[PDB]
Amino acid sequence: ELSSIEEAHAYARLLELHDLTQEALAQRLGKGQSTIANKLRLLKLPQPVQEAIMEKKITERHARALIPLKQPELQVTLLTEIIEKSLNVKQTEDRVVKMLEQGQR
Amino acid sequence: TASVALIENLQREELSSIEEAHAYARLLELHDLTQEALAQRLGKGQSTIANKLRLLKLPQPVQEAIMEKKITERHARALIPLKQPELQVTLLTEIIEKSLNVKQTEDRVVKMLEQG
DNA sequence: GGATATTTCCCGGGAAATATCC
DNA sequence: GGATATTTCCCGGGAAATATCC
């Protein structure tokens, strides 16, 4: 078993080296393209977030919930709150939508 | 002492809920420890262990379905409320036939307790 | 049009909360 | 009173549904 970030870093290589479609890799791995794509999106998140995934301090779906907050600053601010308050994914997703509303004011 | 490390590895590696339960039982006979202390040693809760040990009381037909990976733990656990083995095995085959999930298996259970 | 990115939410493990037993 | 049995439901993986891209 490995970190979502490290699993993503792996998939990336395999898709470069074996000239596969995400679908064909997922079929080869026993997953869905959905799963693979979503994990590859994590490689675009801030390094501080990525390090928290590797250190097993946040979950995949925790980090994935931050992406909607397109600004790295807002992602890392919440990251530390999720750690501090020990927030779940459900209330992390809730927190996100409230910040996007505050931003649109 | 040696058999301990074996099961710890058979536990660390993936196994059937029935076989995980059969394992726990032995470990509690071998070190004579409390469910709490084993769970703490394994990194689980006593809750989890106790619930898995309850599966060893379910009908053999149900237990075989767990090992053969035809039903889930929570599928078999949902049958226990139906205290009669006959009613548990009747639903077992329906869950297989209709390919029912746990949510609608739990629902089915309550309806049979109302009927009986 | 196929591949890929994104949104939504179904699903059951498994543990917290609880009741019961010894 | 502690251990153990039982009930309840929290939790996030991960894939279906969907939108978007090339």
Numbering used by the authors:
A (entry chain A): 126 to 230
B (entry chain B): 113 to 228
Original authors' sentences:
Like ParB, Noc has a three-domain architecture: an N-terminal domain for protein-protein interactions and for targeting Noc to the cell membrane, a central DNA-binding domain (DBD), and a C-terminal dimerization domain (Wu and Errington, 2004; Wu et al., 2009).
To understand the biophysical mechanism underlying the specificity to NBS, we solved the co-crystal structure of B. subtilis Noc (DBD) with a 22-bp NBS DNA duplex. The diffraction of the Noc (DBD)-NBS crystal was anisotropic. Hence, despite the 2.23-Å resolution limit, because of low completeness in the higher resolution shells resulting from the anisotropic cutoff, the resultant electron density has the appearance of lower resolution maps, approximately a 3-Å resolution (STAR Methods). In contrast to ParB, Noc recognizes a DNA-binding sequence called NBS (Noc Binding Site) (Pang et al., 2017; Wu et al., 2009). The role of Noc is also different from ParB; Noc functions to prevent the cell division machinery from assembling in the vicinity of the nucleoid, which might be otherwise guillotined, thereby damaging the DNA (Wu and Errington, 2004; Wu et al., 2009: Figure 1B). By superimposing the structures of ParB (DBD)-parS and Noc (DBD)-NBS complexes, we observed several changes in both the protein and the DNA sites that enabled specific interactions. However, a corresponding base in NBS (adenine 1) positions itself closer to enable hydrogen bonding with this Q173 residue; this is possibly due to conformational changes in the NBS site that narrows the minor groove width at the adenine 1:thymine −1 position (from ~7.7 to ~3.7 Å). However, the equivalent residue R186 in Noc readily forms hydrogen bonds with guanine −6. We also observed DNA unwinding that increased both the minor and the major groove widths at the cytosine 6:guanine −6 position of NBS (from ~7.1 to ~8.1 Å and from ~10.5 to ~11.8 Å, respectively), possibly to move guanine −6 outward to accommodate a longer side chain of arginine. Our Noc (DBD)-NBS structure also shows the side chains of K164 and K169 make hydrogen bonds with the phosphate groups of guanine −5 and thymine 2 of NBS rather than contacting any bases specifically.
